mmCIF file of C-alpha atoms (C1' of nucleotides) and ligand atoms in Angstrom:
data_model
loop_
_atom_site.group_PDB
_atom_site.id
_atom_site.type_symbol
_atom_site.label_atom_id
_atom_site.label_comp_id
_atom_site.label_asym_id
_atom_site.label_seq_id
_atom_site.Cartn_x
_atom_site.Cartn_y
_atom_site.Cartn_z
ATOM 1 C CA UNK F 3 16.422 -12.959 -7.109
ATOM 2 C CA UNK F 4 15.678 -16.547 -7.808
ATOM 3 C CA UNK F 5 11.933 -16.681 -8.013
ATOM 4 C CA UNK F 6 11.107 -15.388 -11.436
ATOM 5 C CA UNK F 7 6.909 -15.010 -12.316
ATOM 6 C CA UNK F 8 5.783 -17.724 -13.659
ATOM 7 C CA UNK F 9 3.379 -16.335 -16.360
ATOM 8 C CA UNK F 10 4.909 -16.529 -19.460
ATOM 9 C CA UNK F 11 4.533 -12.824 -21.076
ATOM 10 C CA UNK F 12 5.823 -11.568 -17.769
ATOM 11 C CA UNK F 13 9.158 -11.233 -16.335
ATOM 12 C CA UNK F 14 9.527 -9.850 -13.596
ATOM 13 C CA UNK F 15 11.615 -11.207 -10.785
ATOM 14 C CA UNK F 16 11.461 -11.574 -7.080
ATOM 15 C CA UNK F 17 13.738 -12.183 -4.135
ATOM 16 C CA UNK F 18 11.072 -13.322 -1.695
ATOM 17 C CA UNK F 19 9.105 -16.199 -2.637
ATOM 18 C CA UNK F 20 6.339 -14.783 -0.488
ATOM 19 C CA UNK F 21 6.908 -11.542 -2.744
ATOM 20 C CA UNK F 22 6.097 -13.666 -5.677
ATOM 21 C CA UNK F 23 2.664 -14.925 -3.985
ATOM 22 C CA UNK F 24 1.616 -11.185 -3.694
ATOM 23 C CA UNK F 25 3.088 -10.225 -6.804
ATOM 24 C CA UNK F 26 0.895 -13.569 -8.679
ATOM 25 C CA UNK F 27 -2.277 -11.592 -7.872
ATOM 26 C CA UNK F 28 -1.449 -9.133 -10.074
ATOM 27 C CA UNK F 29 -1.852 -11.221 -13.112
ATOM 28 C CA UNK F 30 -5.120 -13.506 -11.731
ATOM 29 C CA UNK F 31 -6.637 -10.298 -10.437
ATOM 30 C CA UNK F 32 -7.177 -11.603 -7.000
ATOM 31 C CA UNK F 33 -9.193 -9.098 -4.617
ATOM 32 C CA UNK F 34 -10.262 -11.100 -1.370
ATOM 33 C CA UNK F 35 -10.768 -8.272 0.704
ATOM 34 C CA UNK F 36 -13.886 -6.176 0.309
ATOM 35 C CA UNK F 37 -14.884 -2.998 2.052
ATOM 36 C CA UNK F 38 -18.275 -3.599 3.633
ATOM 37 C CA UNK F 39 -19.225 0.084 3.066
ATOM 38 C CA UNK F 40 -19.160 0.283 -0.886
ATOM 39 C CA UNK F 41 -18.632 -3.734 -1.072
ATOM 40 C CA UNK F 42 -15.425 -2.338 -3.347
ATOM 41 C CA UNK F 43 -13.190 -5.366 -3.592
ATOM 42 C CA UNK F 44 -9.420 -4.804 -2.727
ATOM 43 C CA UNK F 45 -6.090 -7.223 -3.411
ATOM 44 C CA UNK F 46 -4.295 -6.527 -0.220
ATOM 45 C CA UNK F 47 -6.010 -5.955 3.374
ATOM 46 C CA UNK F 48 -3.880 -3.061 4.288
ATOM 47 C CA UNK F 49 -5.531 -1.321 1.435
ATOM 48 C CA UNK F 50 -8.681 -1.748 2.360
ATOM 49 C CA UNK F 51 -8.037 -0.728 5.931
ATOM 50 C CA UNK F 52 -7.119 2.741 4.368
ATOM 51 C CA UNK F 53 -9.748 2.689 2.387
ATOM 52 C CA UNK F 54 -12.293 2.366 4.712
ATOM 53 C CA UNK F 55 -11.550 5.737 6.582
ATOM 54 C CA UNK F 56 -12.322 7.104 3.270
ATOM 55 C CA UNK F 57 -15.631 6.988 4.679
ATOM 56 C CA UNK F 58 -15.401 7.230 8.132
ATOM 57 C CA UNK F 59 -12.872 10.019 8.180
ATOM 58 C CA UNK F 60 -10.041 8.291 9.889
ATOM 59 C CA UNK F 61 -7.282 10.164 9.978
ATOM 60 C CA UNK F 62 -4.797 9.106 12.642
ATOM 61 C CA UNK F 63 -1.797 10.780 11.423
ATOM 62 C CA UNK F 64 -1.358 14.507 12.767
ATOM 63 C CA UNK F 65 1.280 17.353 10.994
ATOM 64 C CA UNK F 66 3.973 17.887 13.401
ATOM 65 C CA UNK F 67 4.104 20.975 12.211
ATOM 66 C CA UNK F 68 0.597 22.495 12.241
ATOM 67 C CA UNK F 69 -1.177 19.402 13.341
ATOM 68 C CA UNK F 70 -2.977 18.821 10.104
ATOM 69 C CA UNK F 71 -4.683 15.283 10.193
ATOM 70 C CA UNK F 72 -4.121 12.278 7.166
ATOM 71 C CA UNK F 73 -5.571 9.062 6.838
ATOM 72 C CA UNK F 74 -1.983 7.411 5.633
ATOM 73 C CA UNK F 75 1.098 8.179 7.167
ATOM 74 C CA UNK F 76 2.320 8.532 3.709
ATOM 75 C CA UNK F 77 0.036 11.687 2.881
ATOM 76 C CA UNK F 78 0.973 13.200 6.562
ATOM 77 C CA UNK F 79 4.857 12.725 4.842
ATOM 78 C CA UNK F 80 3.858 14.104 1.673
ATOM 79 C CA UNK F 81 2.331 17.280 3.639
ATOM 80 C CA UNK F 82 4.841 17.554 6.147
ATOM 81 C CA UNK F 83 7.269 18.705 3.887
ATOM 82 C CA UNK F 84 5.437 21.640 2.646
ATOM 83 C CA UNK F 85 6.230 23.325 5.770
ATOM 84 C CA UNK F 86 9.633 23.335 4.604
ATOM 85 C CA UNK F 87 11.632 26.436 2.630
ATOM 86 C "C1'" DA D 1 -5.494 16.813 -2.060
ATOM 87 C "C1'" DG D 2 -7.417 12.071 -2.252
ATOM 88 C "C1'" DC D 3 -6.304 7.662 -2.605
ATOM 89 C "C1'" DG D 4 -5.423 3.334 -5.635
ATOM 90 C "C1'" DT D 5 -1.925 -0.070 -5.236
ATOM 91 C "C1'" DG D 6 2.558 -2.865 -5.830
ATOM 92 C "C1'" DG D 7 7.152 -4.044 -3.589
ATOM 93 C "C1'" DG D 8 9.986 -4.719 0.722
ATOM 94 C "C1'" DA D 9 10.002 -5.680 5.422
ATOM 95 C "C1'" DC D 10 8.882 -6.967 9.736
ATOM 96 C "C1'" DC D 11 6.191 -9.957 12.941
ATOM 97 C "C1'" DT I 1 0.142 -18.052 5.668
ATOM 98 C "C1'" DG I 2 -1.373 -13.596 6.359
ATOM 99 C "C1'" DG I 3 -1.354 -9.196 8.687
ATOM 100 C "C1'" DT I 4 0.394 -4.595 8.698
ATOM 101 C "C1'" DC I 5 3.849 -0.838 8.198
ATOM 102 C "C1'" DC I 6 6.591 2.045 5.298
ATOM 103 C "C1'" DC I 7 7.578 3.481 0.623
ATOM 104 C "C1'" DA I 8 6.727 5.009 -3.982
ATOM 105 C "C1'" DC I 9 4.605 6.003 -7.756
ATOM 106 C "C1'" DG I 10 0.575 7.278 -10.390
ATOM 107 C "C1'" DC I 11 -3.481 9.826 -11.670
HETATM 108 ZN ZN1 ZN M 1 4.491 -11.464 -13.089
HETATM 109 ZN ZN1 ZN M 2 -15.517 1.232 0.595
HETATM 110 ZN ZN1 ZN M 3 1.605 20.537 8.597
#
DNA sequence: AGCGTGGGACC
DNA sequence: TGGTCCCACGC
């Protein structure tokens, strides 16, 4: 809880220093990670991995259930669920 | 569904 | 640093 955003109009605070450094991109719109497909420019490199099988149709997360295929392991969750009643 | 995207964590 | 998950939330 120490590290409190610099930028004046904002307030937000952060217990992780290194949370901070993420969070200061935010406000200087920082996207050093571009998808060589659509040359889209993304803030963090885990969302451009994702990204990318938006176009080659990675999906590496299979439905337990009825083996349904995602690209994010958090759309498999969101579908998993489904199954439920 | 499809998928952007920030916060927390872990390594 | 910086990479990479999970989470969550949003549209
Ligand atoms: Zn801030
Ligand atoms: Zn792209
Ligand atoms: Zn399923």
């Amino acid at each position: 809880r120490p590290y409190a955003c610099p930028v004046e109009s904002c307030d937000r605070r952060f217990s992780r220093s290194a949370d901070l450094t993420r969070h200061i991109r935010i406000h200087t719109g920082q996207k050093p990670f571009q998808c060589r497909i659509c040359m889209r420019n993304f803030s963090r490199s885990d969302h451009l991995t994702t990204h990318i099988r938006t176009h080659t149709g990675e999906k590496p997360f299979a439905c337990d259930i009825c083996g349904r295929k995602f690209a994010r392991s958090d759309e498999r969750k969101r579908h998993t669920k489904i199954h439920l009643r």
